A paper describes a structure:
The arbitrium system is employed by phages of the [name] family to communicate with their progeny during infection to decide either to follow the lytic or the lysogenic cycle. The system is controlled by a peptide, AimP, that binds to the regulator AimR, inhibiting its DNA-binding activity and expression of aimX. AimR is a transcription factor that in its apo peptide-free form promotes aimX expression. In this study, we deepen our understanding of the system by solving the structure of an additional AimR that shows chimerical characteristics with the SPβ receptor.
AimRKat apo crystals diffract to 2.4 Å and belong to space group P212121 showing two molecules in the asymmetric unit (ASU). Both protomers are almost identical with an average RMSD (root mean square deviation of Cα carbon coordinates superimposition) of 0.7 Å. The protomer fold was similar to that observed for AimRSPβ, consisting of an N-terminal three helical (α1-α3) HTH DBD followed by a C-terminal regulatory domain composed of 19 helices (α4-α22) arranged as 9 degenerated TPRs. The two protomers form a dimer in the crystal, an oligomeric organisation confirmed in solution by size-exclusion chromatography with multi-angle light scattering (SEC-MALS). AimRKat, AimRSPβ-I and AimRPhi structures show dimers with large contact interfaces spanning more than 1420 Å2 in AimRKat. We have therefore named the AimRSPβ-II conformation as the “open” dimer by contraposition of the “closed” dimer conformation observed in AimRKat, AimRSPβ-I and AimRPhi apo structures. Further, this structural comparison also confirms that AimRKat in its apo state exists in a DNA-binding competent conformation, similar to the DNA-bound AimRSPβ structure (RMSD of only 0.87 Å for the comparison of both dimers).
Author numbering:
A (entry chain A): 0 to 386
B (entry chain B): 1 to 386
Write the structure that this text describes.
Amino acid sequence: AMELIRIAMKKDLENDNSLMNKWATVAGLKNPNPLYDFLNHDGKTFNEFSSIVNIVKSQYPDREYELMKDYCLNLDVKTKAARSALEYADANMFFEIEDALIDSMISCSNMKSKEYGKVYKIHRELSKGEIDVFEASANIGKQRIKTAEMNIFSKMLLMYDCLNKGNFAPMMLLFQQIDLSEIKENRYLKNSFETRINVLLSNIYLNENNLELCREYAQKAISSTDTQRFLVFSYLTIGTSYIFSDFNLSKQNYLIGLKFAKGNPGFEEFFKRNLSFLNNFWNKENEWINYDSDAVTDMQEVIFELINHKELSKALQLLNKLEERDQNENELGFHYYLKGLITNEKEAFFKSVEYFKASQDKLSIKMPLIQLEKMGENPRLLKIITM
Amino acid sequence: MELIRIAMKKDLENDNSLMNKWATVAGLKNPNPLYDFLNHDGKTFNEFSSIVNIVKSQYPDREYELMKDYCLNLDVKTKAARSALEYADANMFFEIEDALIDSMISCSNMKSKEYGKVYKIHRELSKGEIDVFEASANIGKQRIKTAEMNIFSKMLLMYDCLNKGNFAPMMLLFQQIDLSEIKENRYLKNSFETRINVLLSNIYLNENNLELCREYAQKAISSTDTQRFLVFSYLTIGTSYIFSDFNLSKQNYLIGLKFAKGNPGFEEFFKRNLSFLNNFWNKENEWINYDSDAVTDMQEVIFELINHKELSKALQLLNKLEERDQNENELGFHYYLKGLITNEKEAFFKSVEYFKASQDKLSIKMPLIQLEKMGENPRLLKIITM
């Protein structure tokens, strides 16, 4: 038993024989034989990578990272299981596991593993902004892809870049070229890619303002997965889809997401900030404000709370202080929106609309737009701006 | 034996002084390369401009025939064949270009093979036979060595970005281009520079930076005598002035129209733009096409009736047009005309929506100006154009 997971399992089985049939059903097996094999013989893998992930999530939930790191670094890089490990690591944003698997798969002599390694490396580089979308497609081309799996993943990696540049027409063009039924042997990879695609589509529809479609895609993703990363982003999207229409559903979706985020500080932050904004926008008591942070976004949330409490003079002073510092366009939109709530000047709301339009934020633009309608501006013309 | 060499030998027999005339027009300090070109099969000039300039000067009416024949018998492995390929693509001489492409991918010379493969990707992307992602993937597959094709592969992607109206990735590719890396091929460097100035010109025309637009179009005009680039540069300058200065718009279109002489297709762009310009500024219009069955021309007829307060005839011809199939840009214009006839705000609002849906940041100004006249808030109208 070289791998940490095999050591723990043999140990726990010595104390409790009934675990064997428990772990068999949790892994999806009709019969426990592959599990006897896994425990006894070095290098014996399950046919599907979900078998081991499920056993680890169930029996050692607190120890997932340590156990999976050790298990992945000990896999034969030439196998289906190592190729599945690479997807698992990237999905969970376990970049240390992933980068080690990538380097050793590019080295190996197996054609399949080499190609997956080279393609995931392109995805890593594009994510980090070390290359742009055109260098990335050029590298995809250089590689002369053979597998149906990497044919699909090369399209998805380009979609990720298109998503974070807010450029949706080319995303849909790439989506159209994907056919998941061509993944014939690797059911773990097919299911994981399907989860990725449902999340991506969810974010598309959220920006194109089809709120119903957005929620349906986010739910499809939630149903298909137990990966923390995808659960977190799906609930974040659902929360956001409700901001303007239903305080209570927005909040509860953020709280469910926050619970799934437990023990990842970075994921937890997204929910705290969104909750802070939500509670301010709907004039509710706000437990989420960060009074210590000197990041612009957080300091704006403190101004917004002063405004809800009719402390207009203090809000104005902190807002003038912020004007001194460098702000991008999205922050300036928010800045002028707050100024408008204090002073009731139409000009501030107009500037706010301009800044949000210039920064390509199709969500926050609704805030000064709602105010301008309240001040008697023409609804028919306001609607045209959001198109 | 090339037709151009036959004509030149013939004209030289009658006039010995042509030799020194053709030498200076070709940019050579000394006539030797020209004696060589006439006498020995396969001898090329160092620069492709040499032969283009001789042909433009001595046989202006025969450019297409002479250049077609010359290019089809070139040594495909040479600098001159690589320059021919640029010349043909710039002029949209697709016959010449496709023949050079096929025979350059055949040859064993690494440089010519790479140019051929890269121009072929440009041709395929233009025709919509592939999308922008297949095109970059093919660029990658090729393993490009030359600095020339490194640059041109970026420009071919710019062309596709332009036709899809997505300008941010164009600018990203523009920033990666450095023309001083083209060390040896002066003809190609100058031609690529022309292409880039035209592309930037059209960017800024859509992003409403009108002064930048004109400056780039002028830079292109200064650098070129290719009729295609002259025509599109003047068309762009004309268009940049539509809303702000009738007279400069008109004069820029008339200079463009003169450069278009003897290409009916190019001439049409100017006639239609002139027709629109005169209608928009309520001037007597000599440019109307009463015979054309194109939507855009039939709209110009309606617009003229409206300027003459012939409202009931305009209404009848407008109802006729509504029956027929129209894209969004035409529908914008359709509802604008309806609004001028009926004075309904609804028609102007729809007009704005159709122009916004069709990504036309210019024509949208027309119903916007009307809405301001009807008392809608100018401050909010300005945001819709931005």
